[PDB]
Specification:
part of a larger assembly; 7 chains; A alpha+beta (about 100); B alpha+beta (about 90); C alpha+beta (about 80); D mainly alpha (about 140); E alpha+beta (about 100); F mainly alpha (about 45); G mainly alpha (about 50); D: about 140 residues; mainly alpha; 8 helices; about 55% helix; G: mainly alpha; 1 helix; EF-hand-dom_pair (chain D); dynein (chain D)
């Protein structure tokens, strides 16, 4: 069953070095799978939802025929990675948090 | 003579189409473009994204800050180095 | 749009939702959101409003008979009243 | 509003509330007035504090300190000093008397001086200096 | 120079008033009743605001308005000399206006 | 040093310090000898 | 459709995470090195000659 495939993708990603977290959030800002506790989850979901719709509106405004498949914000602690796939019937901006300092 | 030599190196690689420096509020100083109908576009669209992202990062644990940011579109890689004085932009398709 | 609690005429509930959504679309900070949502509705209907925008806030407030609205958009919350 | 005015405000607030109470009480204020020579009543100082005390504390603090410095300063940078240099004694007339400059060079007893400066700052080429060409002198 | 959230929460127990236009006795009574509200019910904050403005409702003014929270924004019209904005516990913050 | 630790401290002095202003007169006696003293060594 | 999207994004991000572990870009050499080796030859200065 493909549920084993997506959970396997979580261990594929999460087996990498330093990867603190993986989470998936849909267009209505509600997380679906987690890896964190519940409140760091909901504050990521709200913040990243608003930020990525602003960034996509920025890129679409800047050029009409160009969209984004990628987003990468930096800390001094952890490099949040956002990926979105803007489509109909699905738009699931998955977001990873990682850093190469650990381990 | 180090800042301008780095500008001249960085503007002559295989994909770079524009380097921009913009101040706190605005005033894009030292662009690199043969016309200026789209510099102002960058200068008034992008630092909203830079400080909005500093809000997103810093909200979590206030010892934290933001340093850089990348947005990779289909045909562009908008890299912004935001900090306290200014915002800096480099545009490049890979 | 999502509304959790309101006791007011729906014909200006539509006014409230169309006032808030274009505001949220336009600006990119959340102080000016609560600025605009009061300001433009203030020049529309009445002299007095109050409006809160954020996440995870608590409040007790005296209602108004036909002016009390508690929005919800995209894990961003709005309250406004007279 | 500026950044060094906060420095001088902190130093003067240190000077007034000298014991370390964190609040301006009447006795330290009278100590400051008596160091300046004044020993007024114990009813006018009450009214003075009551106009400056906003919080009801009977003791004024740093927010109230800078409030009074703010109102008195910015209510009433380089315009005034260069302006009132000599032309501001003339108040938008543009004609300065040579006798004022002769008096200035008279009183300060200067050893050697020739007034060729006013001869060679003459930009209307009449024998006097308007204010814009006066700044051009400065 | 502490090095986490937790040592910050060890230090941050003070209840600084961010901005306020209130009398000193006004300020001390309102400040202490809000700290007792926040210590009484950390979990459910709705009934903290229940207690704060219903005490202020019976005692001080017929209209009152309390907002407690974690992260938010606001713009209100308030009659002067009756506004309290304080930071409680180094995180939770409370706006209070008539 | 002998020709430019003087002449970058002679230009570093402050004559008037912080009626009773006659003390300033007395004060401006003292530093006068200072500059005179320094000047002699450079001469 | 949700499953297909998640595995598509997992593939792309997996490439990215490798990209960040490959060589670290954001790392200034000698961020904080205090020990400096310098020039310390003897200096003789005549402050004044007392004559």
């Amino acid at each position: 069953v493909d549920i084993a495939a997506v959970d396997e993708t979580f261990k594929r990603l999460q087996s990498h070095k330093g990867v603190l977290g993986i989470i998936v959030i849909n267009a209505e800002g509600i997380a679906i799978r987690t890896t964190f506790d519940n409140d760091l989850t909901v504050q990521y979901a709200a913040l990243v939802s608003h930020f990525t719709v602003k960034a996509r509106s920025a890129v679409r405004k800047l050029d009409g025929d160009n969209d984004l498949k990628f987003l990468r914000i930096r800390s001094k602690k952890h490099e949040i990675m956002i990926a979105p796939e803007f489509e109909r019937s699905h738009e699931y901006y998955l977001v990873v948090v990682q850093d190469p300092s650990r381990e | 003579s180090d800042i301008e030599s780095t500008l001249t190196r960085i503007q002559g690689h295989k994909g770079v189409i524009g380097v921009i420096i913009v101040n706190n509020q605005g005033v894009p100083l030292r662009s690199t473009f043969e016309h200026d109908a789209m510099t102002k576009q960058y200068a008034d669209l992008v630092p909203g994204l830079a400080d909005l992202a500093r809000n997103l990062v810093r909200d979590l644990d206030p010892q934290n800050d933001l340093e850089f940011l990348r947005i990779r579109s289909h045909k562009h890689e908008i890299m912004v180095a935001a900090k306290d004085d200014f915002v800096l932009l480099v545009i490049q398709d890979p | 749009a999502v509304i959790k609690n309101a006791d007011m005429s729906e014909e200006m509930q539509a006014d409230a939702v169309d006032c808030a959504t274009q505001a949220l679309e336009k600006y990119n900070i959340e102080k000016d959101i609560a600025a605009y949502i009061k300001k433009e509705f203030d020049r529309k209907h009445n002299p007095t409003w109050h409006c809160i925008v954020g996440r995870n806030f608590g409040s007790y407030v005296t209602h108004e008979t036909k002016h009390f609205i508690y929005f919800y958009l995209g894990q961003v919350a709005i309250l406004l009243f007279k | 509003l500026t950044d060094e005015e906060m420095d001088m405000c902190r130093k003067a607030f240190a000077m007034f509330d000298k014991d370390g109470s964190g609040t301006i009480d009447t006795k330290e204020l009278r100590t400051a007035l008596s160091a300046l020579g004044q020993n007024p009543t114990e009813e006018d100082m009450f009214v003075m504090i009551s106009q400056v005390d906003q919080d009801g504390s009977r003791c004024i603090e740093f927010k109230e300190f800078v409030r009074v410095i703010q109102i008195n300063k910015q209510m009433s940078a380089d315009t005034l000093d260069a302006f009132v240099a000599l032309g501001g004694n003339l108040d938008k007339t543009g004609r300065i008397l040579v006798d004022k400059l002769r008096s200035i060079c008279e009183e300060f007893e200067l050893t050697v001086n020739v007034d060729r400066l006013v001869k060679d700052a003459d930009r209307d080429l009449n024998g006097f200096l308007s204010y814009d060409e006066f700044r051009a002198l400065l | 120079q502490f090095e986490d959230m937790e040592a910050f929460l060890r230090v941050a127990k003070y209840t600084l008033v961010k901005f306020t236009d209130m009398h000193v006795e006004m300020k001390e009574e309102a400040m202490d009743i809000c700290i007792t509200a926040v210590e009484k019910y950390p979990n459910d904050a709705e009934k903290c605001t229940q207690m704060i403005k219903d005490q202020m409702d019976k005692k001080f003014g017929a209209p009152w308005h309390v907002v407690v929270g974690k992260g938010f924004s606001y713009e209100i019209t308030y009659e002067v000399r009756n506004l309290l904005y304080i930071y409680v516990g180094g995180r939770t913050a409370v706006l209070l206006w008539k | 040093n002998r020709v430019d630790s003087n002449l970058g401290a002679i230009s570093s002095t402050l004559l008037v310090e912080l009626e009773g202003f006659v003390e300033q007169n007395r004060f401006q006696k003292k530093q006068a000898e200072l500059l005179a003293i320094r000047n002699e060594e450079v001469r | 459709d949700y499953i297909r999207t998640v595995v598509q994004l997992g593939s792309s991000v997996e490439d990215l995470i490798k990209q960040n572990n490959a060589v670290d870009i954001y790392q200034e050499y000698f961020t904080n090195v205090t020990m400096d080796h310098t020039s310390e030859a003897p200096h003789v200065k005549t402050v004044t000659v007392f004559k």
